[PDB]
Amino acid sequence: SSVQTAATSWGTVPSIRVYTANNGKITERCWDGKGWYTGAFNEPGDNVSVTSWLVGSAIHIRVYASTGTTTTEWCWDGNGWTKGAYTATN
Amino acid sequence: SSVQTAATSWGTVPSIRVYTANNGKITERCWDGKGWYTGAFNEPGDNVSVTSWLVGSAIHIRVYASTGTTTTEWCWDGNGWTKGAYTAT
Amino acid sequence: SSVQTAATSWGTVPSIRVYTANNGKITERCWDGKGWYTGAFNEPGDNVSVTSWLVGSAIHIRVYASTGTTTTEWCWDGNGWTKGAYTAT
DSSP B22-65: ETTEEEEEEESSS-EEEEEEEEE-SEEEEEEEEETTEEEEEEEE
- List, as one string, the DSSP characters of A7-56: EEEETTTTEEEEEEEETTEEEEEEESSS-EEEEEEEEE-SEEEEEEEEET
Contact B49 A3 (CB under 8 A): no
Instruction: Provide the domain count of chain C.
Output: 1
Q: Establish if C89 belongs to a structural domain.
A: no
CA dist C23 → A45, A55, B1, B20, C3 (Å): 18, 36, 11, 20, 8
Q: Establish if A32 belongs to a structural domain.
A: yes
Q: Establish if A70 belongs to a structural domain.
A: yes
**Which one of A7, A35, A38 has the shortest CB-CB distance to B64?**
A7
> Quick check: A29 contacting C, CB < 8 Å?
no
**Structure solved via:** X-ray
Number of other CB atoms surrounding residue B87 within 10 Å:
12
Contact B47 A14 (CB under 8 A): no
Q: Establish if A33 belongs to a structural domain.
A: yes
Contact C71 B7 (CB under 8 A): no
For B:54-73, CB contacts with C below 8 A are none
User: What 8-state DSSP symbol labels residue B3?
Assistant: -
Q: Please, which residues bridge with residue C29 across strands? A: C18, C38
CB contact at 8 A, B32 and C75: no
CA dist B39 → B2, B15, B16, B20, C8 (Å): 21, 12, 11, 11, 23
Q: Please, which residues bridge with residue A72 across strands? A: A65
The Cα of C2 is separated from the nearest Cα of chain A by a number of Å equal to 4
> Quick check: A50 contacting C, CB < 8 Å?
yes
Q: Establish if B89 belongs to a structural domain.
A: no
CB contact at 8 A, B46 and A3: no
Question: What is the domain extent for residue A12?
Answer: 2-84
- Which of C75, C63, C83 shows the shortest CA–CA distance to C5? C63
Nearest 5°: the CA angle B12, B58, C65 is 50
CATH number at residue C58: 2.40.128.190
Q: Establish if A89 belongs to a structural domain.
A: no
Q: Establish if A90 belongs to a structural domain.
A: no
Instruction: Please report all neighbours of B, defined by 3+ CB atom pairs within 8 A.
Output: A, C
Q: Establish if B18 belongs to a structural domain.
A: yes
